[PDB]
Amino acid sequence: SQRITIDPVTRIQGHLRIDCEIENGVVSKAWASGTMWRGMEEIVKNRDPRDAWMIVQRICGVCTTTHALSSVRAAESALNIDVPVNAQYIRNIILAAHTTHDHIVHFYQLSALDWVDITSALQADPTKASEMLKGVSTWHLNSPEEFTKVQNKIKDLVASGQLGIFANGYWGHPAMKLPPEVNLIAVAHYLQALECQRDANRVVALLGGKTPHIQNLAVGGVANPINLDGLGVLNLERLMYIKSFIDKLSDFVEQVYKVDTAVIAAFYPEWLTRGKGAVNYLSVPEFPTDSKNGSFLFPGGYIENADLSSYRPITSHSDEYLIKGIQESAKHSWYKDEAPQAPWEGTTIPAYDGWSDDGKYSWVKSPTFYGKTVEVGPLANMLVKLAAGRESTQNKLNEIVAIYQKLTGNTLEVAQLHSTLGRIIGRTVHCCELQDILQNQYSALITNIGKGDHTTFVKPNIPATGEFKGVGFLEAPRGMLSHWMVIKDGIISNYQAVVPSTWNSGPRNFNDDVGPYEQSLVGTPVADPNKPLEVVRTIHSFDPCMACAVH
């Protein structure tokens, strides 16, 4: 029996501490703690509703774009603004391209070193490594020559004695199961991923004005001036340049990331039977395509007790059933007001008192949906899409399963998706489907401009009296995001963000029910309590973002 602390958890966004009680070599109880707070909700209070998005975008630079977009949607909701369809296309391309960068970096830069041993890659035969991928991928950069060059880079780094960020990693740990050749393939793909994510962000930059932190939004639409015949504005040459980057993303996503996902599952199938965080799942529809903030390309919904057959669809960002269910508690968080609060009535009054196992132990609030704990994020969004019968999602999942089948002789059932690996799989499926979102929305924009619609912005008015409440939903890379704005006498009187990592990382709630991170860890085997790699494996599967969780 013993108590361990993992502080800092690395290869996430932000500041996270995980504590675990281990008994008989398995985690019996866990605590998740966000250890940094800024008070972004308070910083934005009493300002003009039109200004909020530039401030609250800075909740997070990993999921840049997302808080900007949720904030304008919230102001638009309060004000009853319908966003021009061209502004929706541009917003959608930005979110889809951003999320492509975000997921790729998560799988490779953030998560791969939980599963991949770089020392073992030094023992690989590059030719055997390449041979392993014959008939498995059509990617053009899996040659033995590529892999030898990558192996020499690792060799040279080790030879220098300055391992830096690769130093004191979990090399030779018994939970590292990949053959040397597969470790080498993974490092080669890690490096290749950096080129693909750079291209995804070039799409973002061309519409956003830069990234991180886009600068093209407005309450009422976007700041991009559409004029095919205009110098210095969003013309056909600029649109062609955007398309040139959109086109560079698919091959890596489909032929490397999608395949690596299937391969990690094939070598680590025990991780299909652990890391279940919840039995309830929520996602919101995303990528609106009509003139009234709807007609979403991706569906949303609520799953209760893992029952896909009786799920509740969510087709509108104005759905009162979704809106009315959401509350947050601070019983086990470092804030003063503890009872569950609807976010329009939310407070964020700091009340730090140090760590207590049975009291307050986190700056993350505890969200519930009609009093239940819920997992959000790519596992939720995949399960909802499967519940909806979305053919694209079924088909993409099936491709991953077919690779897993070929490698193992076993198949993958939906029950096995409620797991650390299922979570990873949902993220990969999301990234793959996002490439069709990009092609669809680029084509929709070109076509609409061709009909003579260059409209991008409707100037808002904000009554100087009255109190108005708005909510902006967004399906972010890490799950359902919502910004809740109250306007009174023309200024923001309350602002509350309920962020996907808040849902997943939040501590024990008002009824002392355990959040998804804490739940997922129960049952985790820990071979070496001083080097608890297995705990970090499951925690990384949720893609924690603690600047997001806490704000």
Partner 1 sequence: PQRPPVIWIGAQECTGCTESLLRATHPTVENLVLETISLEYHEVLSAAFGHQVEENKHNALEKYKGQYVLVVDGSIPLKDNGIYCMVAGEPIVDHIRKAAEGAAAIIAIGSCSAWGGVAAAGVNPTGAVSLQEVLPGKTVINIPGCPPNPHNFLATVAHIITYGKPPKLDDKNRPTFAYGRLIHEHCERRPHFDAGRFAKEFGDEGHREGWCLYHLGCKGPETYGNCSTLQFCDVGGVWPVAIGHPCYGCNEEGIGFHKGIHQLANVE
> How far apart are CB 353 and a second copy at their closest, in Å?
48
- Pattern 529-548, binding to ligand FCO, x per CB under 6 A? ----------------x--x
**Rounded alpha-carbon distances, angstroms, from residue 414 to 65, 376, 517:** 32, 17, 21
- Pattern 19-58, binding to ligand SF4, x per CB under 6 A? ---------------------------------------x
Chosen from a second copy, ligand SF4, Mg ion, none, partner binding at 58 (C-beta under 5 to 8 Å by type): ligand SF4
Chosen from a second copy, Mg ion, partner 1, none, partner binding at 409 (C-beta under 5 to 8 Å by type): none
Q: Which residue is nearest to Mg ion (CB)?
A: 497
> How far apart are CB 62 and Ni ion at their closest, in Å?
5
Chosen from a second copy, Mg ion, Ni ion, none, partner binding at 497 (C-beta under 5 to 8 Å by type): Mg ion
Residue 241 or 352: the one with the smaller Cβ distance to a second copy is 241
> How far apart are CB 51 and ligand SF4 at their closest, in Å?
15
Positions that interact with Mg ion (CB under 5 A):
497
Chosen from Mg ion, ligand FCO, a second copy, none, partner binding at 12 (C-beta under 5 to 8 Å by type): none
Residue 84 or 377: the one with the smaller Cβ distance to ligand FCO is 377
Calpha distance 470→71 (Å, rounded): 10
- Is residue 548 marked as binding? yes
Q: DSSP letters of 346-411?
A: ----B------TTS---SS-EEEETTB--B-SHHHHHHHHHHTT-HHHHHHHHHHHHHHHHHHS--
Q: Pick the binder of a second copy from 89, 107, 139, 296 (CB under 8 A).
A: 139
> How far apart are CB 246 and a second copy at their closest, in Å?
19
> How far apart are CB 231 and ligand SF4 at their closest, in Å?
14
Q: Give the residue from 414, 549, 421 showing the smallest Cα distance to 478.
A: 549
For 440, the enclosing helix (H) or strand (E) is helix 420-450
- Pattern 65-94, binding to ligand FCO, x per CB under 6 A? -x----------------------------
Q: Which residues pair with 33 in a beta bridge?
A: 17
Calpha distance 251→432 (Å, rounded): 10
Task: Answer for the pair 516, 538: CB distance below 8 angstroms, yes or no.
Answer: no
Contact between 501 and ligand FCO by CB under 6 A: the answer reads: yes
Q: Which residues pair with 286 in a beta bridge?
A: 298
Task: Answer for the pair 36, 27: CB distance below 8 angstroms, yes or no.
Answer: no
Contact between 292 and a second copy by CB under 8 A: the answer reads: no
Residue 149 or 336: the one with the smaller Cβ distance to a second copy is 149
- Is residue 432 marked as binding? no
Task: Answer for the pair 417, 428: CB distance below 8 angstroms, yes or no.
Answer: no
| CA dihedral sign of residues 119, 123, 127, 129 | negative
**3-class DSSP state of 71:** helix
Q: Helix H segments across 209-285?
A: 236-246, 250-252, 258-267
Task: Answer for the pair 427, 107: CB distance below 8 angstroms, yes or no.
Answer: yes
Task: Answer for the pair 282, 299: CB distance below 8 angstroms, yes or no.
Answer: no
> How far apart are CB 351 and ligand SF4 at their closest, in Å?
25
Chosen from ligand SF4, Ni ion, a second copy, none, partner binding at 38 (C-beta under 5 to 8 Å by type): none
> How far apart are CB 64 and ligand SF4 at their closest, in Å?
8
Under rule CB under 6 A, which residues in 51-70 are in contact with ligand SF4? Answer: 58, 61
Contact between 476 and ligand FCO by CB under 6 A: the answer reads: yes
Positions that interact with Ni ion (CB under 5 A):
60, 62-63, 545, 548
**3-class DSSP state of 154:** helix
Residues in CB range of 87: below 8 A, 6 or more apart: 221, 222, 456, 457
**Rounded alpha-carbon distances, angstroms, from residue 259 to 13, 39, 135, 189, 330:** 25, 41, 11, 11, 41
Task: Answer for the pair 540, 18: CB distance below 8 angstroms, yes or no.
Answer: no
- Is residue 196 marked as binding? no
Calpha distance 209→224 (Å, rounded): 9
Residue 209 or 212: the one with the smaller Cβ distance to ligand SF4 is 212
Contact between 149 and a second copy by CB under 8 A: the answer reads: yes
Residue 63 or 526: the one with the smaller Cβ distance to Ni ion is 63
Calpha distance 259→263 (Å, rounded): 6
Strands 221-222 vs 491-498: parallel, antiparallel or unpaired: unpaired
Chosen from partner 1, ligand SF4, Ni ion, none, partner binding at 166 (C-beta under 5 to 8 Å by type): partner 1
- Is residue 60 marked as binding? yes
Residues that constitute the known binding site for Ni(2+): 60, 63, 545, 548
Q: Which residues bind a second copy (CB under 8 A)?
A: 130, 137-143, 145-146, 148-149
Residues tagged in the binding site annotation: 60, 63, 545, 548
Residues in the site for ligand FCO, rule: CB under 6 A?
A: 60, 63, 66, 476-478, 481, 499-501, 545, 548
Residues contributing to the site for ligand SF4 (CB under 6 A): 58, 61, 212
